[PDB]
Paper text:
The SAM complex facilitates outer membrane β-barrel precursor protein folding and insertion into the outer membrane. The SAM complex consists of one copy each of [name], which spans the mitochondrial outer membrane, and [name] and [name], which sit on the cytosolic side of the membrane. [name] forms a 16-stranded β-barrel which is minimally closed between strands β1 and β16.
3D reconstructions for the SAM complex in GDN showed a mixture of monomers and three predominant dimer conformations.
Residue numbers in the entry:
A (entry chain B): 87 to 113, 126 to 324, 330 to 512
B (entry chain a): 47 to 73, 78 to 113, 126 to 171
C (entry chain A): 26 to 128, 139 to 262, 264 to 289, 292 to 333
D (entry chain C): -32 to -23, 2 to 75, 105 to 178, 237 to 424
E (entry chain b): 393 to 424
Write the structure that this text describes.
Amino acid sequence: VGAATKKLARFDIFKEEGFGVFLSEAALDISIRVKEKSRLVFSAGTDFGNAEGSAYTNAVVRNIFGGAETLTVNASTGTRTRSAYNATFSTPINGNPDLRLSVEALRSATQKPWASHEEHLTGANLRLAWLTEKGDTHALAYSSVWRQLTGLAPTASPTVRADAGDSLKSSLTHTFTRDRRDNPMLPQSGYLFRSVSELAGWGPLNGDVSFAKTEVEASGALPVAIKSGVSVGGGLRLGVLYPLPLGYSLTGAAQPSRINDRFQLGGPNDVRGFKIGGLGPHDGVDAVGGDVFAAGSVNALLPLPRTGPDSPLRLQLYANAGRLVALNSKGTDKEGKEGLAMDSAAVFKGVKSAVGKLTNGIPSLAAGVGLVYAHPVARFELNFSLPLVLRRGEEGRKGLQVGVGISFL
Amino acid sequence: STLEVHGATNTRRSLLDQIFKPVLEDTTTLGQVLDRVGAATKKLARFDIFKEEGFGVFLSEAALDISIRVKEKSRLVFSAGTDFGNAEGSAYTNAVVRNIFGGAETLTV
Amino acid sequence: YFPLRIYEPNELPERSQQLTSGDLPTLYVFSTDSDARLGLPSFNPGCLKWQTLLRLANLDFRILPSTNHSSPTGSLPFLLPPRTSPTASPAPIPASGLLSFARDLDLGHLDADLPPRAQAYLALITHSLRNAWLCALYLDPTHDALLRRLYVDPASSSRAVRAALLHQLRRAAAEQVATASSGGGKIVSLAPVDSADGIDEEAVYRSARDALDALASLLRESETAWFGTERPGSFDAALFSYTHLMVEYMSEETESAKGRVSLGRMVKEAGNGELAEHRERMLGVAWPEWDGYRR
Amino acid sequence: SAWSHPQFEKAVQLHVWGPAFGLPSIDAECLAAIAYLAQTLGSADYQLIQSSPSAVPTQHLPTLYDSRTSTWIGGFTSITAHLHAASATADGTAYTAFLSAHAAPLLALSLYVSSANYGAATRPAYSAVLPLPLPWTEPPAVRAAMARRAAHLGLSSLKSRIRLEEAAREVLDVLAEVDWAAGGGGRQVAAEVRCLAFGYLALMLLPDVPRPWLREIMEGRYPALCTFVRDFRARVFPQGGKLLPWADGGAQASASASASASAVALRFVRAVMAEVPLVGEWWSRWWTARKKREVLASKGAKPAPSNDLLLLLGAGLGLTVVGAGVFFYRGLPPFGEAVQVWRKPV
Amino acid sequence: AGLGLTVVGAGVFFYRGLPPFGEAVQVWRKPV
């Protein structure tokens, strides 16, 4: 009945605190109790008079028929155009609370100050998230978006002036996470392999981008010796952005990636000791990303001496690293054809050479010291870092490196 | 000379006029400064449609030339946060439209 | 004093060194890749004017197609100087200073305050002919193939986005034709008349006909194949910007059943055909070698 | 699809705004039309019905309405096209275009963008010529329109005046050499252009305009302009315009037959329905399509029947939103009981 | 239907209510 009750709680429609299992030794006679989570929850607080529209709508219907669930978030600032949608619809496929499907349609308008522009996304994606009994978690999503770039207000750069159109990016991407760490918000003893692949427009997938994005993230952690929360850390990351032809082939012609698709490696969440978008093939001041990259870390996370195994507020002694290169061809005969159509051989040679450049020279090697606070929902770093080695034009940072979030190193 | 009321949007000109047409009517006694404009401004604030903090009175010694500023209080303010699942209905609606035509105002709780 | 080693700035990506390497300044006009390599005239007048003016100023440059979002301002036809350092950019030169950037011998007559009469006549070209072009292109449904294969299909190649872009362009054009009182500023609620149902085309068409006739009559008083001067100046370029595109794209002779002879016929038939010769003679100073015109 | 040219099947009554400035009307296009008719026709035939945008099927004010064929014509240029060496006509066309554009964006800077003026001298004039409930809705639409036309100058209410006087010079220096009303001097232009220029200038000059910058310029640097305006007004509009054949009674009694409480309520409710958050734009588009079809039918042709997809889609979106909002509020009845019991299979 | 319409129309009407009546700057002069 432990398996029964855990499988029951996995439905995410029963309130977490208070279940009860009452065994009446009458003449089994098991009696379970539950609480219901809730039903329709609403909020709509709007303001006006001036530019403020603050339409502020929220809605959650926890259970429509079975496990179904519709989230509907909204906003209207009156300054920004709108966020007219964010509408999810989750429902287990008739078999278990483990295999959960969800369908989401969105229309948001992000912002990217590090490569100065905005980006209007108005797609709608379909997701199918498994969960294996061993703890692993697979997922698989199909997303189709619009990706408009309309904010080149300052002197941005000749790079983004050349990549400021539209796209579709219909893609099919599959994550994977094996979580074996004791405290997910402050790893001390576990390990964490997480692999997120993605195939964009290719073969049956139609669009205007055609790549294959791979993003592997390992981990590690270990307390050594004299409950002594030593907690030696670890980390690593990798990645490649491989362009491909536009249909049902491997050999063809590929157009190099757009700024909408490259990686950006820096900031308090990925490699501390840098701007939010440092460590790139920078152009002027705007941070253009790259395709290949890497990472690293070596932590200590020692607790406050003479204080004891208190709440997890510990000193963080950590080195760091990072590298992020771009797909320069510069190795074949001139295309002859007008511009952006690389044959397969040139793309392969370019990515081989790029990975070759990844292993030439010491990467960046920051440092720091910070007071980690492991809240159950978030983690607060507050580091104070010192970037050792830079490439010219990577926007080093040296003050107080405040950071908040979930993903860290 | 003149009199400017900056920021006083969403309020009829006749409403402010009913107060400020006299303020200029009695303005000899020029050899010194006589500001009954205190009465004007207090009567203005008594409307309860101008935000209380920040009025300003800027006298530009140009060749009176009084310049008043105001802030607007607000317009339609809303809230509707409901809950269900059990006996709780908590329909919780609130609304305030601070200025419909002149000084009008509808509260709806 | 803490960063100990500095290593060779990071080798910009492939797009950003293939498109924007350059050696000579690159003007950004609406065009198609098959054309931009040849420097052939654009298909939007607001950019063909600037391209023609610059080519008259004997500036050496190339044109790359762009998409109206990548400009320091809203409208497109801006310019960028070449890179001086593989990671450093000069300032982007907006549309207004294109002539100031061009400075040879004498670049005064390309930009000089015209006699008052000429500023009165520029109103024809800038508002009457422009509303006529905007209407005939973005609203007349027999020009849907042109509008698509010129402004939409080069964008996205994803029909669900093509449709939205087409609708956006049509709304933004109808809002502009309904402002200038050539057709009419019908007054509706606190929002512009963004549809083809406030833009009655008889007024716009008749205004276009009269504008062309007035210009053709003015050109006959100069006796020097230009508008009063010796070498084509700003006015001739502004005129060409429209009298060409109204010939290459809207000279479809069909028309006899619907009446309302299409623009290119009026353009070539203005006065006694003086605007046609004027265009065919501006092609002969700007593009001394190009052919293929007259459709 | 209501974004294309419309498909087809195979004793005038000049509606204008009210006088409202010491002139026969306002909205210089209207005054131009009324002066042209007063010069051309004779006080026997036309009727000068006072009106409003929502009172006509064209939605465009200086609107003629013939009696013999019952056709609506809008705009000043279309009207003067109706009711009818070469450098004369050439310059006529040139200055007609130059007044319609680049001279109207000035009469907006004054009187519609300068909030010290629109509210002290204009909104009274609009409220003085409209039925009771409307002025809450129509004058703001007119102001938004003239403000949009006033852009493409880059100027708004912000020494921020010398540039304004420069902007005004940049137009009057061209309007000055016209030699408008003279038997000698510069160049003759036309009747229908001279009247248009009078309309525009006389609204540039004659208002009271608490914060004036057009009066000062036009009276300081331009003698011929003010001379022309004053002489024209004193010649064709003696006594401010009481000799013009308005409707049955004159100024106010003109917009009496077309201003029943029902019709005025309809005007108001239409102008406010066009503002609802979601169905507003679609309703406005369907309405404008219907009115354009009506005008086209009146002119003598037969349009395409209709495409009700616009209002159908607007109503469908509104209904979908409200029905989804109401449905989940007290949604479907509950599916599960308080106690559910299983037994041991035997 | 009348009650439903009244409620929804009042709710929609005051949301983006009537156009504003007062300008940013309003100016009086000295009577002469």
